[PDB]
Motif scaffolding. Structure first.
Motif, short mmCIF file in Angstrom:
data_model
loop_
_atom_site.label_atom_id
_atom_site.label_comp_id
_atom_site.label_asym_id
_atom_site.label_seq_id
_atom_site.Cartn_x
_atom_site.Cartn_y
_atom_site.Cartn_z
N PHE A 54 38.27 59.87 19.97
CA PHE A 54 39.48 59.95 20.78
C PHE A 54 40.68 60.42 19.93
O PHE A 54 41.30 61.44 20.26
CB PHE A 54 39.75 58.59 21.45
CG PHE A 54 38.76 58.23 22.56
CD1 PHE A 54 37.98 59.22 23.18
CD2 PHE A 54 38.62 56.92 23.00
CE1 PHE A 54 37.08 58.89 24.20
CE2 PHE A 54 37.72 56.59 24.02
CZ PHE A 54 36.95 57.57 24.62
N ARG A 64 51.54 69.00 22.83
CA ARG A 64 51.71 69.63 24.13
C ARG A 64 52.85 68.94 24.86
O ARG A 64 53.78 69.59 25.35
CB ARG A 64 50.45 69.48 24.97
CG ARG A 64 49.90 70.77 25.51
CD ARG A 64 48.69 71.24 24.71
NE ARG A 64 47.65 70.21 24.67
CZ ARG A 64 47.15 69.59 25.73
NH1 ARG A 64 47.58 69.88 26.96
NH2 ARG A 64 46.22 68.66 25.58
N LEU A 112 39.79 64.35 29.20
CA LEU A 112 40.85 64.40 28.21
C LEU A 112 40.99 65.76 27.56
O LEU A 112 40.00 66.45 27.31
CB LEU A 112 40.59 63.36 27.12
CG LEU A 112 40.63 61.91 27.58
CD1 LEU A 112 39.62 61.70 28.70
CD2 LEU A 112 40.33 61.00 26.40
N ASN A 113 42.23 66.14 27.30
CA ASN A 113 42.53 67.39 26.64
C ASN A 113 41.85 68.59 27.28
O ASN A 113 41.81 69.68 26.69
CB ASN A 113 42.12 67.29 25.19
CG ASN A 113 43.17 67.81 24.27
OD1 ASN A 113 44.27 67.27 24.21
ND2 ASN A 113 42.85 68.88 23.56
N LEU A 128 41.63 51.49 24.65
CA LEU A 128 42.63 51.28 25.68
C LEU A 128 42.45 49.96 26.41
O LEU A 128 43.40 49.40 26.95
CB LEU A 128 42.61 52.43 26.68
CG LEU A 128 42.87 53.78 26.00
CD1 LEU A 128 43.18 54.82 27.06
CD2 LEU A 128 44.05 53.64 25.05
N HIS A 217 49.91 50.29 26.90
CA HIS A 217 49.29 51.03 25.82
C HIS A 217 49.85 50.62 24.49
O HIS A 217 49.12 50.53 23.52
CB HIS A 217 49.47 52.53 26.01
CG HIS A 217 48.84 53.34 24.92
ND1 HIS A 217 49.25 53.26 23.61
CD2 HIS A 217 47.81 54.21 24.95
CE1 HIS A 217 48.50 54.06 22.88
NE2 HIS A 217 47.63 54.65 23.66
N1 LIG Z 1 44.06 64.43 28.75
C1 LIG Z 1 45.50 64.59 28.37
C2 LIG Z 1 45.87 63.84 27.07
C3 LIG Z 1 45.07 62.55 26.73
C4 LIG Z 1 44.33 62.45 25.50
C5 LIG Z 1 43.71 61.26 25.13
I1 LIG Z 1 42.73 61.18 23.25
C6 LIG Z 1 43.80 60.11 25.98
O1 LIG Z 1 43.20 58.96 25.58
C7 LIG Z 1 43.82 58.01 24.68
C8 LIG Z 1 45.23 57.96 24.55
C9 LIG Z 1 45.74 56.99 23.64
C10 LIG Z 1 44.94 56.15 22.92
O2 LIG Z 1 45.41 55.18 22.08
C11 LIG Z 1 43.49 56.26 23.09
I2 LIG Z 1 42.28 55.19 21.91
C12 LIG Z 1 42.97 57.20 23.97
C13 LIG Z 1 44.49 60.17 27.18
I3 LIG Z 1 44.58 58.55 28.40
C14 LIG Z 1 45.11 61.36 27.55
C15 LIG Z 1 46.00 66.01 28.46
O3 LIG Z 1 45.26 66.82 29.04
O4 LIG Z 1 47.11 66.29 27.95
#
Ligand SMILES: N[C@@H](Cc1cc(I)c(Oc2ccc(O)c(I)c2)c(I)c1)C(=O)O
Lengths: 243, 12
Positions: A54, A64, A112-113, A128, A217
């Motif tokens: 992650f 971003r 994610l991302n 999380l 968070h």
């Molecule tokens: N998907 C998004 C960005 C996005 C990236 C991630 I890695 C995510 O997970 C997390 C975040 C904080 C943490 O402490 C942990 I551990 C996991 C999440 I929720 C979102 C985008 O497209 O910008």
């Protein structure tokens, strides 16, 4: 009901150009979606193999978010000290939003991302904790709203421009900025005229849902800093959530 | 500080 003004429309066109040029893989995502292996995060606490997978990407994610606020003029008209306060407070809020809006109910997995597809569990055990359910429960819910870039975008701004973050300097100026977006957002909503009873008020509740997610968070961040190696915490990650 | 600052400064 009431709609936008030639000026507010122009505002929208902006926010959007932003969120779109700062949203990973755009609307060509489902084709880069690479599901995380079934084995990462299973039968136990935390699960470092996940926590890693992650934070291994959490860096370019925050950037971003930063790049998004940078394309907002009302943002650059603020002090470099506040521009930060904002980023720090709304960073998680804007990120998790961006993910929920990408929840495939069939597969039951977030993305994610725009590259990694995770599961309620995975995300939970990953660090999380309770927030996963919260972030997923959101996704599911939103599937009904069918928010378009603009909407997501505006929602993201409403968050960025939180006048309540502590340490803020130019409060008053900001609040109206937020006020300036909220209105536009609502109006844009009327033009959209979604088929969803008693609306906006609901959409507003989501803003809260997202603030709760972020507020929590942070808590989870601390445990993460106790149950996890400081050898896995990218800087920006720390730079953002660390006090 | 630190990085953030860096991200808020790049034209690019
Ligand atoms: N998907 C998004 C960005 C996005 C990236 C991630 I890695 C995510 O997970 C997390 C975040 C904080 C943490 O402490 C942990 I551990 C996991 C999440 I929720 C979102 C985008 O497209 O910008």
């Amino acid at each position: 009901k009431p709609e936008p003004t030639d000026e507010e429309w122009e505002l929208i066109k902006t926010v959007t150009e932003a969120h779109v040029a700062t949203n990973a893989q755009g609307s060509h995502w489902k084709q880069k979606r690479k599901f995380l292996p079934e084995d990462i995060g299973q039968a136990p606490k935390v699960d470092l193999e996940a926590f890693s997978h992650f934070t291994k990407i959490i860096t370019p994610a925050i950037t971003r978010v930063v790049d998004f606020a940078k394309k907002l003029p009302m943002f650059c008209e603020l002090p470099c000290e506040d521009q930060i306060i904002l980023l720090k407070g709304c960073c998680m809020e804007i990120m998790s939003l961006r993910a929920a809006v990408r929840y495939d109910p069939e597969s039951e997995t977030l993305t994610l991302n725009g590259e990694m597809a995770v599961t309620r569990g995975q995300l939970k055990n990953g660090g999380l904790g309770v927030v996963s359910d919260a972030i997923f429960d959101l996704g599911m819910s939103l599937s009904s709203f069918n928010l378009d870039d603009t909407e997501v975008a505006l929602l993201q701004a409403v968050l960025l421009m939180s006048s309540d973050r502590p340490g803020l300097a130019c409060v008053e100026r900001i609040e109206k900025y937020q006020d300036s977006f909220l209105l536009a957002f609502e109006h844009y909503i009327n033009y959209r005229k979604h088929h969803v009873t008693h609306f906006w008020p609901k959409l507003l509740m989501k803003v809260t849902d997202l603030r709760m997610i972020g507020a929590c968070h942070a808590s989870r961040f601390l445990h993460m800093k106790v149950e996890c190696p400081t050898e896995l915490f990218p800087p920006l990650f720390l730079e953002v959530f660390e006090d | 500080h630190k990085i953030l600052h860096r991200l808020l400064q790049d034209s690019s």
